[PDB]
């Protein structure tokens, strides 16, 4: 932060001479001087260059063309405008947040002006930064306490060992000095929630629109377990979603509760839909209570909003129909549903305080934002028992947390306030819609097959595309209107291989082959499987990463139409088995895999294996008690149908839990066994395309193995 801009040139000498004198004075205090051209030049030095803090221009030249455009990008940006004798303000400059610093054209006083700019810049640093981060940076340059924790003490022990000097010189002197524990009084303690830590929670909840927020320093997986240990005593009933995460699986194995699983919707391409509105009724929930032994009235509900793909729900209908005093919305993938007019009334924080109810959200911080690892938040909108809900945080967090993550966790909330933060969400949406239009433009004009985006036929608007009932792009049978929304930044690429009715085709290329080609250039695919893809377009994805993704997709069509070799295209796959991948081309492998999908029938064995839920005999907590004593045996892949499993099955593709640890597979769930046998017969003939199921390890003959309980 040391860029000073001097716009325009009056042509006179009594105004340019103070500029030349100030040019030699600002360089003595480490400041970069730039000379923009016209009005459009200064506008490009703010959106692209974020390290700018000084704008010098003539007040009697552009008093309305600059004070309006700059105010739409930054509010606290200092404006070192130079006024004259006959200078005044404008009536249209009253409702604009600006920081104008007036000066004169006096000779010899250039040294006093440089001291005022440095002090004004220091005031800008101490204002945009939160009091927790500001106190951490000031403690390094002043606070020098001895006999404290940890033992490194700002990197002192590393300066006495040859191996320690290499680890200290990698980060920096300010990095080790910032790692302090609870041995500081002028910064407070995270677990004590007092002083700077007390005002930090009230600042994050105010920016993200919430009553109270926490700073979890143990990842998002921990924030999901803190909520579960509140509205679920030793013997209750919760409403957990079927499309859960591995973190939510261990939550059901630590509390003696009886969960009730829902039945989300889905299509044939593998895109996870949502829970219908009929499941949120009062007669539907009360019907499953009598059918499930040892279950009372549900006092907690868990809703995965949004899912792993990227489909939001309708919170305006759930907060009124779902009569649950503890509704959870796992917002671990949409930490931006606030600073945009196309997201009002779509999340839990949007709206007022619902009486008798409360909304829980666990927004991920180190996923689609900018902070260190092991960071999460807990958003509460209502009135909860802080005296008890906070007790679950100490059971997973040590007494000496790492303040380096806390400073970055609150920083993500400070980067959103103002026009400088609002352009990050809208900027990613404009780059996402532009990328969606480039696919349809290069599809008709091209000569042959081309990728497709799972989007409606009309994408001219800039909002969330609703999943209506009179459309064919979503492919959901009997979907509720005004309930499922589309995420613009979550671009889902559909590879040609299936039809619009749910069947197959002769010519098709699976998504697993394209995913391996993108990894050669450095593009990591988030989700892949049958004929679908997924990419993360958050605030950190600039225009370089967006345009580089399209170039890699166009190169795949050129290498496939010309019929190239595997060695001259996929060097990583060739090193796994050079003998088998010797005389093989890109067209021979793409067609042999497509015939196996039609032969083994993938879309039919997948849609029918996730609708029928397995018979839950006992609670998941009772299944973990048998493993502690040593009552777990082993069965074959076909012998698991009819027993009580102990681990959660997470098959790839798609990536949803198949059988919960404690459910019995009966004959009613017949496609469940047919889905596991289908993935084993298709991933046992080509190296690199093996079956990946978290629970069924690979053996040496073809059949996988699982783990069940003893009889």
């Amino acid at each position: 932060m040391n860029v000073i801009a001097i716009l325009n040139h009056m042509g006179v000498y009594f105004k340019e001479e103070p500029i030349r004198e100030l040019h030699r004075a600002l360089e003595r205090l480490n400041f970069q001087i730039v000379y923009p051209n016209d009005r459009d030049d200064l506008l490009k030095l703010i959106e692209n260059n974020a390290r700018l803090c000084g704008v010098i221009f003539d007040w009697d030249k552009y008093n309305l063309e600059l004070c309006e455009e700059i105010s739409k990008m930054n509010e606290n940006l200092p404006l070192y405008a130079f006024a004259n004798t006959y200078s005044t303000l404008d009536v249209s400059l009253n409702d604009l947040r600006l920081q104008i610093s007036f000066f004169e054209y006096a000779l010899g006083a250039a040294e006093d002006i440089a001291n005022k700019i440095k002090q004004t810049t220091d005031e800008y640093i101490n204002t945009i930064l939160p009091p927790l981060t500001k106190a951490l940076f000031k403690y390094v340059r002043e606070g020098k306490y001895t006999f404290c924790t940890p033992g490194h003490m700002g990197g002192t022990a590393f300066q006495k060992s040859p191996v320690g000097s290499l680890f200290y010189d990698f980060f920096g002197p300010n990095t080790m000095k910032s790692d302090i524990s609870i041995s500081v009084s002028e910064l407070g303690s995270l677990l004590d929630h007092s002083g700077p830590h007390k005002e930090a929670e009230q600042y994050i909840a105010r920016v993200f629109n919430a009553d109270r927020s926490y700073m979890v320093t143990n990842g998002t997986s921990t924030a999901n377990k803190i909520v579960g240990m509140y509205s679920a005593p030793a013997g209750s009933t919760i409403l957990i979603d079927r499309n859960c995460h591995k973190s939510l699986t261990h939550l059901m194995m630590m509390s003696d509760v009886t969960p009730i699983y829902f039945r989300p919707t889905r299509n044939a391409y593998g895109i996870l839909g949502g829970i219908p509105q009929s499941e949120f009724q009062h007669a539907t929930i009360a019907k499953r209570v009598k059918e499930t032994p040892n279950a009372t009235w549900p006092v907690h509900a868990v809703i995965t909003n949004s899912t792993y793909d990227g489909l939001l729900y309708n919170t305006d209908f759930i907060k009124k129909t779902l009569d649950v005093k503890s509704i959870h919305f796992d917002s671990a993938w949409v930490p931006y549903t606030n600073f945009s007019p196309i997201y009002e009334g779509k999340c839990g924080m949007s709206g007022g305080r619902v009486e008798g109810k409360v909304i829980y959200e666990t927004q991920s911080t180190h996923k689609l934002l900018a902070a260190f690892s092991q960071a999460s938040m807990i958003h509460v909108k209502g009135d909860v028992n802080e005296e008890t809900f906070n007790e679950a945080y100490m059971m997973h967090t040590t007494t000496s947390p790492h303040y380096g993550i806390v400073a970055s966790t609150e920083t993500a909330a400070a980067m959103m306030k103002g026009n400088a933060g609002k352009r990050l969400i809208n900027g990613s949406i404009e780059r996402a819609i532009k990328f969606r239009k480039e696919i349809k433009r290069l599809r008709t004009e091209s000569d042959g097959w081309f990728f497709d985006v799972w989007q409606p036929d009309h994408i001219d608007t800039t909002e969330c595309w609703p999943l209506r009932s009179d459309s064919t792009w979503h492919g959901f049978k009997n979907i509720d209107n005004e309930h499922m929304y589309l995420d613009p930044i979550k671009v889902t690429l559909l590879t040609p291989g299936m039809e619009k009715d749910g069947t197959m085709s002769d010519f098709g290329i699976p998504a697993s082959i394209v995913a391996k080609y993108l990894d050669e250039h450095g593009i990591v695919v988030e989700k892949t499987g049958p004929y679908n893809l997924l990419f993360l377009f958050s605030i950190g994805i600039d225009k370089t990463k967006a345009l580089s993704l399209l170039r890699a997709l166009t190169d795949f069509k050129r290498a496939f139409d010309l019929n190239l070799r595997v060695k001259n295209m996929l060097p990583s796959l060739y090193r796994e088995d050079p003998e088998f991948y010797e005389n093989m081309r890109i067209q021979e492998l793409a067609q042999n895999i497509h015939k196996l999908i039609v032969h083994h029938n993938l879309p039919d064995l997948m849609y029918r294996a996730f609708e029928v839920l397995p018979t839950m005999v006992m609670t998941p907590y009772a299944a973990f008690q048998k493993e502690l004593h040593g009552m777990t045996e082993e069965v074959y892949l076909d012998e698991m149908v009819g027993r009580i499993n102990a681990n959660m099955i997470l098959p790839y593709p798609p990536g949803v839990p198949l059988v919960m640890p404690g459910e019995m597979i009966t004959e009613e769930s017949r496609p469940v066994l047919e889905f596991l046998q289908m993935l084993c017969e298709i991933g046992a003939h080509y190296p690199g395309f093996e079956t990946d199921i978290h629970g069924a390890y690979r053996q040496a003959d073809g059949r996988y193995t699982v783990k069940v309980l003893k009889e």
Binding site: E634, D638, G642, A646, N647, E667, Y697, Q699, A700, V706
Partner: protein, 180 residues
């Protein structure tokens, strides 16, 4: 009985599809450092079971045709580790053998010459189905014995005998098919 026989027959076919003769070592889930194993589940339940081998070897300066292991001692070596102790030819004391894990998921008994020998299990209606099928079959014979004595009632129409007997023969024709 339709809600009972319809579930036992459905459970009988559920277990039949689950199951020359080789011993394939299987694994379990979880997260473990090394590699733990375990014996066969419902296939073997005896405590002092025997295991057969293909190529014979000269262990302890003598020949052997079958090696028997202890079920209580096999569950600890394949999970906690260490060394295994097993007798030869079903006689003598449980001597220490050089048994380890094979890459092809088998049990190779090593000797003094580092030779390979893949072990195998001897070949053979589950016990759970047989216990529930015999109790349900005895209940059908008791209900049929009562009907085969009071059917001579004069105050009973003749058209009703064609449907009551047909409902009993339909259940008996299905209960005798799963026990084949």
């Amino acid at each position: 009985m339709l809600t009972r026989l319809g579930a036992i027959v459905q459970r009988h076919l559920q277990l039949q599809q689950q199951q020359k003769t080789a011993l394939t070592v299987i694994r379990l889930g979880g997260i473990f450092s090394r590699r733990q194993q375990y014996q066969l589940p419902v296939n073997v339940t005896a405590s002092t079971l025997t295991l057969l081998l293909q190529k014979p070897l000269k262990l302890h300066d003598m020949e052997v045709v079958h090696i028997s292991f202890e079920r209580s001692a096999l569950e600890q070596w394949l999970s906690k580790g260490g060394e295994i102790r097993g007798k030869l030819n079903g006689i003598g004391f449980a001597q220490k053998l050089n048994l380890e894990v094979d890459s092809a998921q088998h049990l190779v008994v090593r000797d003094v010459s580092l030779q390979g020998s893949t072990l195998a299990l001897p070949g053979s209606l589950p016990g759970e189905i047989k216990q529930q099928l015999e109790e349900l079959e005895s209940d059908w014979r008791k209900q049929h014995a009562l009907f085969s004595e009071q059917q001579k009632c004069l105050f009973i129409p003749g058209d009703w005998l064609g449907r009551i007997e047909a409902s009993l023969q339909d259940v008996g024709a299905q209960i005798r098919q799963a026990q084949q």
